[PDB]
Amino acid sequence: MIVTVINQKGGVGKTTTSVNLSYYLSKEKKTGLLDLDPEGGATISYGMKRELKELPLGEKSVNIFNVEVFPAHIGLLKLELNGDVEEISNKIKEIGKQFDFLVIDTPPNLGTLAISAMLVADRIVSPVTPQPLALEAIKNLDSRLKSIGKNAYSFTNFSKKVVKLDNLSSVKFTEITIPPSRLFIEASRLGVPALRYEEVRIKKPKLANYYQQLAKVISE
Amino acid sequence: MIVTVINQKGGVGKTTTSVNLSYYLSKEKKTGLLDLDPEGGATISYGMKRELKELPLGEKSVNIFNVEVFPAHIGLLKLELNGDVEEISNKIKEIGKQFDFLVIDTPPNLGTLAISAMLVADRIVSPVTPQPLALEAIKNLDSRLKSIGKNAYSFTNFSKKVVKLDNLSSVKFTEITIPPSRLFIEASRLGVPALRYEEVRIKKPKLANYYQQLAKVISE
Numbered sequence: 001m002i003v004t005v006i007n008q009k010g011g012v013g014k015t016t017t018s019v020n021l022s023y024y025l026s027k028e029k030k031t032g033l034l035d036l037d038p039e040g041g042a043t044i045s046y047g048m049k050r051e052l053k054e055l056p057l058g059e060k061s062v063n064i065f066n067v068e069v070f071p072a073h074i075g076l077l078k079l080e081l082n083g084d085v086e087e088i089s090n091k092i093k094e095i096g097k098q099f100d101f102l103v104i105d106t107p108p109n110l111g112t113l114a115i116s117a118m119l120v121a122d123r124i125v126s127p128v129t130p131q132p133l134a135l136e137a138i139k140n141l142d143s144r145l146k147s148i149g150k151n152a153y154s155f156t157n158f159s160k161k162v163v164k165l166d167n168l169s170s171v172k173f174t175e176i177t178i179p180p181s182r183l184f185i186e187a188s189r190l191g192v193p194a195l196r197y198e199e200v201r202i203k204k205p206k207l208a209n210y211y212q213q214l215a216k217v218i219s220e
Numbered sequence: 221m222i223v224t225v226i227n228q229k230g231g232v233g234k235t236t237t238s239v240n241l242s243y244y245l246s247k248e249k250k251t252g253l254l255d256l257d258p259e260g261g262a263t264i265s266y267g268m269k270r271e272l273k274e275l276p277l278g279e280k281s282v283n284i285f286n287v288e289v290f291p292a293h294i295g296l297l298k299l300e301l302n303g304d305v306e307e308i309s310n311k312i313k314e315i316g317k318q319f320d321f322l323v324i325d326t327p328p329n330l331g332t333l334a335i336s337a338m339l340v341a342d343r344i345v346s347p348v349t350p351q352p353l354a355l356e357a358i359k360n361l362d363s364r365l366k367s368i369g370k371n372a373y374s375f376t377n378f379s380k381k382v383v384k385l386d387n388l389s390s391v392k393f394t395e396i397t398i399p400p401s402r403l404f405i406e407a408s409r410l411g412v413p414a415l416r417y418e419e420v421r422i423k424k425p426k427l428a429n430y431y432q433q434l435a436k437v438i439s440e
């Protein structure tokens with residue numbers, strides 16, 4: 001199963017979702033994380049730096065915290081400029097064949113990598129925020145997804161109350177809402193998944209429920 | 221500079237010392253960590269698993285938390301038996317030339333990998349706990365150190381009180397003592413160096429003073 005996390009707007013929580021969903025899924029299924037953002041947010045979130053080599057897509061990977069992380073690298077930049085959507089899509093599918101779950105983190109744009117990951121995805125996951133630009137982006141995702149007739153699952157981040165938009169037929173808003181929490185800030189500073197930092201940091205973990213609900217709603 | 225962490229007694233703190241000293245050094249100098257224990261304590265402390273491949277010594281490495289970590293692998297086993305001591309020594313020097321600091325974790329024994337790491341070390345560090353068996357271990361470590369024309373710095377772990385011993389001349393006894401702290405246990409649970417975890421977990425990190433003392437004493 002290929003799960004791609006998409007949002008045109010930056011800072012909405014794409015990397016956090018990819019990191020924690022892949023970490024949650026790796027608890028009982030063989031999971032990989034493909035960092036298609038050239039800036040390597042997910043790579044940094046697993047304690048690594050983006051590779052200063054032009055690697056082919058999917059070549060280099062490290063098993064960290066039971067997730068097979070494919071670190072971001074400068075080669076992606078080239079693909080972001082010259083890449084063929086068909087070729088990149090096929091490579092992503094060949095990569096996904098080795099995992100029960102391949103979570104793909106994508107850049108905050110509508111570029112080649114994001115479009116390829118969005119096209120090959122079995123599940124498309126988008127976080128929405130109370131911020132205005134995220135609302136514009138969720139409506140744009142609904143329109144462009146309407147065109148090729150694919151669906152996404154939207155959940156809410158940076159909020160205690162769900163954000164839902166009316167007359168977006170291609171975007172299923174779940175009831176999941178992830179409130180502001182400096183657990184995420186501390187875990188990202190440390191360079192580990194927040195789901196993993198939580199098991200040590202607090203007595204009663206609370207973030208595991210969000211990602212269990214996400215995996216629940218998207219699975220099969 | 222090559223720093224080798226040595227103790228034949230198990231569970232005294234070899235891996236904690238290797239992991240945290242290499243991490244501390246990584247803040248200012250190009251630092252690597254060479255895991256020469258086939259059970260891979262340092263590797264696990266950097267969120268990884270020992271490789272189920274018989275690798276040549278020093279081939280695989282991952283930059284985790286700014287440390288170039290050479291994960292343990294099953295190929296160490298063969299090298300423990302049939303490893304040419306001079307070959308292994310030259311390979312370790314070969315590896316360490318690329319770093320300002322190469323911290324080396326060793327198994328709890330006297331075998332070929334450990335003894336090579338002792339031979340080509342610029343500094344050897346030994347943690348001693350106030351347990352009864354640890355004193356015999358530091359004793360016979362002095363016997364080992366004289367037999368190879370080498371000398372080592374000793375500090376105390378799991379204690380507010382320093383351990384020193386009068387009789388042994390190849391073992392310089394520092395005043396450095398590291399008290400029992402639940403930070404190390406929480407960090408091993410996480411699979412990160414305790415220094416990094418502490419720098420994210422509390423307002424005023426305080427474990428770094430011990431490893432600063434260690435760096436100061438071993439670099440004079």
Ligand SMILES: Nc1ncnc2c1ncn2[C@@H]1O[C@H](COP(=O)(O)OP(=O)(O)NP(=O)(O)O)[C@@H](O)[C@H]1O
Nearest residue numbers: 010011012013014015016108158179180181184188
């Ligand atoms: N619910 C939350 N509460 C508090 N901080 C959060 C939350 N979710 C995410 N963050 C933090 O907000 C920052 C940005 O989140 P991030 O996951 O990088 O979004 P992003 O979409 O990947 N940014 P980008 O890849 O550049 O488009 C990170 O430092 C996260 O740790």
Ligand SMILES: Nc1ncnc2c1ncn2[C@@H]1O[C@H](COP(=O)(O)OP(=O)(O)NP(=O)(O)O)[C@@H](O)[C@H]1O
Nearest residue numbers: 230231232233234235236328378399400401404408
């Ligand atoms: N000062 C300390 N306070 C509390 N726990 C500690 C302290 N130092 C080490 N530990 C813990 O003690 C355990 C054993 O330490 P470790 O660093 O693995 O020693 P070791 O010599 O490498 N074990 P081994 O490779 O089998 O000989 C680990 O779980 C550490 O986190």
Ligand SMILES: [Mg+2]
Nearest residue numbers: 014015037041
């Ligand atoms: Mg990101």
Ligand SMILES: [Mg+2]
Nearest residue numbers: 061062063271
């Ligand atoms: Mg592997």
Ligand SMILES: [Mg+2]
Nearest residue numbers: 234235257261
């Ligand atoms: Mg050890």
Ligand SMILES: [Mg+2]
Nearest residue numbers: 051281282283
């Ligand atoms: Mg490298």
